[PDB]
């Protein structure tokens, strides 16, 4: 079920920060000959459209604060309420007919943004909070909703203690280089 | 005798179901058992009065998309939130040492479509991480306030292979086995 990139911002977006580094990827990607679509996930969206804005997508991108250790509510509700219905577009079933293979959707991906206001440190020292696993570690369970219908994750960005040391001019600037990389 | 709070993720009848072994097996062992449906329109303030009374927090709810349903969450971000002051303090600044009920415990009680051999293996959908792997920041939401992990009891392939009766008997027996 899956066919320049057209790509969809899921915007989980205080909610100033998520809103701004939305609009860097939305202005930079078009200006790499990109096509985006940009959706507010704490929004009355239309889950069949959702469902057709996956299929029309290439890449997902999911621009959202830690809230809780994880996706905000809304976001996990658009989830729930998106990829459950889809159920026969992104996925067939979990694959056993090895779980996690019944996706319909392979060749498509998706890449991680975060704001979080935990320090690097505390993702990354072995001896700390999240035991070293990492971002990555941290959002394993949401990689793998993503990767469930068979997509393929884009190194994540996350930008840290946005609030306890903000800088939305170093934030910006980083994550408008890292979407080159990737994009370019 | 401890007092435990009973978050019945269900949206479901297997949950509500496995809410009532919980209930049910803690009273009889001595315990006095309060029972928050996850998804229903619970008043913030009530549920952090909850939290304080609880020595113990289970969660019982079912995978969705690798996780707690999204009214689970919103639980979460609801009450965790409206705790500040009396939950938790600050991020501690290292960042999780701010919680304020250190010596409550909390629990998952899980109930997942896919099978256990999906959670062990390193060349599996997890890669070997286990089911505690998958809920690290689950886990994690509560150490930040301090609380601290009992075992965590998980019923497999409940659609594929509904086992109700097993997962009764099992749950029943891992609740005697903590707080017996």
């Given at each position: 079920h899956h066919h320049s990139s057209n790509i969809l911002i899921i915007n989980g977006a205080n909610?100033?920060?998520?809103?701004?580094?939305?609009?860097?990827?939305?202005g930079t990607?078009?200006?790499?000959?990109?096509?985006?679509?940009?959706?507010?996930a704490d929004s009355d969206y239309d889950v069949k459209a959702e469902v057709q804005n996956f299929l029309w997508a290439d890449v997902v991108i999911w621009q959202m604060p830690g809230w809780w250790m994880g996706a905000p509510w809304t976001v996990k509700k658009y989830i729930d309420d998106v990829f459950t219905e889809?159920?026969?577009?992104?996925?067939?079933?979990d694959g056993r007919t090895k779980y996690g293979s019944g996706g319909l959707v392979q060749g498509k991906k998706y890449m991680l943004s975060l704001t979080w206001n935990a320090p690097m440190?505390?993702?990354t020292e072995?001896?700390?909070?999240?035991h070293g696993v990492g971002?990555?570690?941290?959002y394993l369970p949401f990689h793998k909703a993503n990767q469930f219908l068979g997509m393929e994750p884009l190194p994540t960005f996350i930008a840290n203690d946005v609030?306890?040391?903000p800088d939305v001019p170093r934030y910006t600037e980083?994550?408008?280089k890292h979407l080159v990389e990737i994009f370019g």
């Open positions: 909610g100033q920060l998520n809103d701004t580094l939305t609009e860097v990827a939305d990607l078009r200006d790499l000959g990109h096509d985006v679509r940009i959706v507010r889809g159920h026969g577009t992104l996925y067939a079933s440190e505390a993702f072995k001896d700390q909070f999240f971002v990555d570690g941290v609030i306890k040391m980083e994550y408008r």
